[PDB]
A paper describes a structure:
To investigate this phenomenon further, residues Ser-178–Val-190 were deleted to create a C-terminal truncated mutant, NCS-1ΔCT. The solution behavior of NCS-1ΔCT was significantly different from that of the full-length protein. Size exclusion chromatography-multiangle laser light scattering analysis showed that NCS-1ΔCT was polydisperse, with a molecular mass between 29,300 and 42,000 daltons, compared with that for the monodisperse full-length protein of 21,880 daltons. We infer from these results that without the C-terminal region the NCS-1 hydrophobic binding site is completely exposed, causing the protein to self-associate. The palm is the hydrophobic ligand-binding crevice, and the fingers are formed by hydrophobic residues positioned on the surface of the one subunit in such a way that they slot snugly into the hydrophobic crevice of the other subunit. Hydrophobic residues from helix 3 and the EF1/EF2 loop (residues Phe-49–Phe-58) bind to the N-lobe site; residues Val-136–Pro-139 in the EF3/EF4 loop region bind to the C-lobe site. The protein-protein interface buries a large area of about 1854 Å, which means that nearly one-third of the surface of each subunit forms the interface in the homodimer. First, it serves to occlude the hydrophobic binding crevice in the absence of a partner protein and to prevent protein self-association and nonspecific interactions.
Neuronal calcium sensor-1 (NCS-1) is the primordial member of the neuronal calcium sensor family of EF-hand Ca2+-binding proteins. It interacts with both the G-protein-coupled receptor (GPCR) dopamine D2 receptor (D2R), regulating its internalization and surface expression, and the cognate kinases GRK1 and GRK2. Consequently, in the Ca2+-bound state, NCS-1 folds in such a way that the two lobes are oriented to jointly present a large, solvent-exposed, concave hydrophobic crevice onto which peptide, proteins, and other hydrophobic molecules can dock and bind.
Author numbering:
A (entry chain D): 8 to 39, 43 to 173
B (entry chain A): 16 to 135, 144 to 174
């Protein structure tokens, strides 16, 4: 399966032509997916807190062409940046998660929406440790630091340098 | 025939329907469990935490998740009492299954959580909660110390 797609998903991911095949072999086999399916599979296999919120945010970054499904092209490239990507690409990858409305800015409420979604999964359970502060207070501390010009919005540059 | 779980036998029918809908082979192994965690945390490396969680699901430790282990795990974690939820979590921390949670084991859990999201310290954090829960200061955590310490 997969012919000259492998060559293409090699130049865009820096995975080898041996790794792209195994990830496809594993993609259609194993466990699996639309938004509903990914959301419920996240609830089943990650039984700590409520992964409902974060599952939605993650799915939307996965589904780049916004068709309601995660094709192999989107999955292998998303996996690429976090595992093989440069620091710049990784911070830009994190930026898309926070930038909910995709306008090139991170607002205080946008960052709060992400932090709180993560907080509900591992930060607020009685089973897993963490945190020490609150998504309310953590975002205020980090926003005050990164927002150099204090305009209430975070650019990619402010986000990158702050990190 | 598992009336032994907080599910009705009307709910059990539906969960098997969903099980064979997910993994039709009836056996999701470590590799399959590992890659979906890659999906659940595409901002780091969920490898460590995926392994730990998988070991708690797979109760008989054969490297596979049968329906029996899957249906019992969902029960305790989603509908179980606080003690039962804390007891199920205890197995996660207790890596070597000796009935204790040691300092490095909990550190192994926290950093595993730290590694999966670490882009968007574990040392100072573990010292804080371990000192709190370990009442007799023997360097080990019992289920009782863990349960009371969490509440
Ligand atoms: Ca898509
Ligand atoms: Ca925005
Ligand atoms: Ca700004
Ligand atoms: Ca098993
Ligand atoms: Ca132990
Ligand atoms: Ca003790």
């Amino acid at each position: 399966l997969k012919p000259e797609v492998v060559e293409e998903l090699t130049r865009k991911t820096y995975f080898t032509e041996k790794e792209v095949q195994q990830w496809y072999k594993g993609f259609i086999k194993d466990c699996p997916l639309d938004a509903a399916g990914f959301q419920k599979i996240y609830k089943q296999f990650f039984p700590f807190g409520d992964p409902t919120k974060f599952a939605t945010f993650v799915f939307n970054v996965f589904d780049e062409n916004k068709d309601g499904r995660i094709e192999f092209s989107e999955f292998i490239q998303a996996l690429s940046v976090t595992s093989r990507g440069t620091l710049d690409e990784k911070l830009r990858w994190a930026f898309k998660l926070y930038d909910l409305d995709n306008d090139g800015y991170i607002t205080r409420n946008e960052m709060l929406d992400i932090v709180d979604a993560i907080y509900q999964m591992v930060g607020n359970t009685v089973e897993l440790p963490e945190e020490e502060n609150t998504p309310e207070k953590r975002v205020d501390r980090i926003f005050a630091m990164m927002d150099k010009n204090a305009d209430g919005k975070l650019t990619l540059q402010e986000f990158q340098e702050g990190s």
